[PDB]
Amino acid sequence: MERGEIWLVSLDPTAGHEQQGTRPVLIVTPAAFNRVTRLPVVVPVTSFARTAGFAVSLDGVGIRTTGVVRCDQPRTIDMKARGGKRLERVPETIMNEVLGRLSTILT
Amino acid sequence: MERGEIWLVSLDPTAGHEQQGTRPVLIVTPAAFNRVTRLPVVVPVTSRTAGFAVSLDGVGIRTTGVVRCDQPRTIDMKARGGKRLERVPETIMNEVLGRLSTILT
């Protein structure tokens, strides 16, 4: 599993304001990391918006998944245990914008 | 809720190899972010620094073990009933950010 892939996966159960539901998530970590840990770091996709703050729009880039990437909510998940399913990849431009947002808070 | 604080909190329920239990976690995101979102990003503490694991030892921290810088998670600290324990020295926080940052390389 590569950085930049969108996977459909259940994030439940959750507490409080935590992002809920089965939804697309974007893989942040690279293949080697994902292979060794079996615990990729992902950010969730939620619902035609413009990029603003931690929310990066997926509109107009040629992919099937719609909405925005919530770069403020990274989570380490056991994709295999949760039964995630690979959907597609995002263009490197989107991935780099996401990495840029995460860089402001995880470094 | 500041970057560098260790809080004791229930992480459950989680799946598979994800960390579980009620354990110490280290807050990675800054106070303003934590206030606005109510959803700090934390890395868990589990029982020498090696790879993504940063040792808490030798620097006056009461919490023992290693910080798993490879396992960030966004949690609602308040909803889970987290309790603030202590704050790590900046040297430790800088080592943690150093390792954590590499997930973005």
UniProtKB/Swiss-Prot annotation, chain B:
Biological process (GO) annotations held by this record are:
mRNA catabolic process; rRNA catabolic process
Does DNA-binding appear among the keywords? yes
Q: What is its EC number?
A: 3.1.-.-
Query: What top-tier enzyme class does this entry carry?
Result: hydrolase
Query: Any idea which UniProt keywords this protein has?
Result: DNA-binding, Endonuclease, Hydrolase, Nuclease, Plasmid, RNA-binding, Toxin-antitoxin system
GO molecular function list: DNA binding; RNA binding; RNA endonuclease activity
Key word DNA-binding present: yes
- Which protein family is named in the record? Belongs to the PemK/MazF family.
Q: What is annotated about its quaternary structure and interactions?
A: Homodimer.
- What does the protein in this record do? Toxic component of a type II toxin-antitoxin (TA) system. Probably functions as an endoribonuclease. Responsible for the stable maintenance of the plasmid during cell division by postsegregational killing of plasmid-less daughter cells. Neutralized by coexpression with cognate antitoxin PemI. Both PemI and PemK proteins bind to the promoter region of the pem operon to autoregulate their synthesis.
Supply the name of the protein: Endoribonuclease PemK
This chain's source organism reads Escherichia coli
